Design a protein around this ligand. Structure first.
Ligand SMILES: Nc1ncnc2c1ncn2[C@@H]1O[C@H](CO)[C@@H](O)[C@H]1O
Ligand SMILES: [Cl-]
Length: 339
């Protein structure tokens, strides 16, 4: 694989992990394994957890996690590229330097001060409260820059999470149109149930440019519900997404993979009339769907773009998620300790 073969664009966020008290979940009305965008009623959570001791700071972002692990798996330096918007703060410096350590080529945009780098309150006891911050300032102007668009041009594989719809939809759309036009591999993730509910137009449009669509059970149920797929919603959703017309009208295979936690994941394509089950490895009160979901995408892509068949890539996907599960959160340790 050549340098900058894989391109990613998303929201560069700093994960603030803290052992949360029981009242925290009731106080801010947080559910299990869920992600919510920080509203006004949530804003006090960031000062509240900052008083806590033993705070752990990890470079996050759905797309960034996937891309940097793909880079980590392939081992060859500078194969992956990433674009996002951080703030002019120490948090942005932490994220930037964490990418350079992994030999990840980046072209970060710096938001206008005092807009700080986005952050995610990770309350473990595991719920997430997300303040996008500077990640919102990601603009088409920064992307259309010569030294930035060069990374898009040189890439043959793209990964963009659905989260980027809230921040820079116009940017991800332009990259998607580029990918389909040049017959490249565009990989898309449903990311969160609320995206299919409140941004249905954006999701379906992105699907029309996607060669591979990632998602989980809850995202599929929300997507199928908003599309009127009532009976056998999950199975109907995978079929619906797989069979949607591509935006250029050309006939090609779109792959759809739906994770279902500890239960068998589903996969199918446009030319496949059957929806296949895939048995997944069991763990100790943990699952493939979640942090691990981003790793699942990374593990699948890292092998699939290197010629590995569907089944083999799925095992590589489970392997990648199992690695993140075995560790505390999304942190990439020694490469030789990955087998
Ligand atoms: N709105 C969001 N946009 C992009 N990434 C997010 C968002 N919310 C949570 N994440 C990231 O998702 C990961 C967990 O799957 C964490 O690294 C976290 O930073
Ligand atoms: Cl993202």
């Amino acid at each position: 694989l050549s340098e900058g073969y894989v391109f990613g664009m998303g929201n560069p966020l700093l994960d603030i992990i803290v052992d949360a008290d029981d009242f925290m979940y009731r106080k801010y009305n947080l559910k299990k394994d869920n992600i919510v965008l920080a509203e006004e009623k949530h804003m006090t959570i960031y000062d509240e957890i900052q008083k806590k001791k033993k705070l752990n700071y990890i470079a996050g972002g759905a797309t960034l996690n996937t891309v940097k692990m793909i880079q980590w798996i392939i081992q060859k330096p500078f194969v992956c590229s990433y674009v996002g918007c951080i703030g002019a703060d120490i948090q942005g410096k932490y994220i930037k330097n964490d990418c350079s350590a992994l030999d990840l080529v980046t072209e970060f945009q710096i938001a206008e001060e005092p807009l700080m780098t986005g952050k995610v309150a990770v309350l473990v006891s595991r719920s997430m409260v997300t303040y996008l911050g500077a990640a919102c300032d990601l603009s088409l102007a920064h992307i259309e820059q010569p030294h930035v668009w060069s990374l898009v041009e040189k890439a043959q594989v793209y990964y963009i999470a659905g989260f980027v719809i809230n921040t820079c939809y116009e940017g991800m759309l332009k990259i998607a149109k580029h990918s389909l036009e040049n017959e490249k591999l565009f990989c898309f993730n449903l990311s969160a149930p609320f995206l299919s509910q409140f941004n249905t137009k954006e999701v379906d449009e992105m699907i029309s440019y996607s060669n591979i669509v990632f998602g989980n059970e809850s995202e599929a149920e929300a997507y199928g519900e908003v599309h009127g797929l009532l009976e056998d919603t999950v199975h109907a959703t995978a079929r619906y997404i797989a069979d949607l017309p591509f935006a250029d009208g050309k006939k090609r295979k779109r792959l759809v993979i739906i994770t279902r936690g500890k239960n068998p994941l589903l996969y199918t394509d446009s030319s496949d009339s059957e929806i296949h089950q895939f048995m997944v490895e069991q763990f100790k009160d943990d699952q493939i769907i979640d942090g691990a979901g981003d790793a699942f995408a990374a593990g699948f892509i890292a092998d699939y773009i290197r010629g590995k068949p569907m089944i083999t890539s799925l095992h590589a996907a489970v392997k990648a998620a199992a690695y993140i599960i075995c560790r505390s959160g999304f942190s990439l340790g020694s490469r030789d300790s990955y087998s």
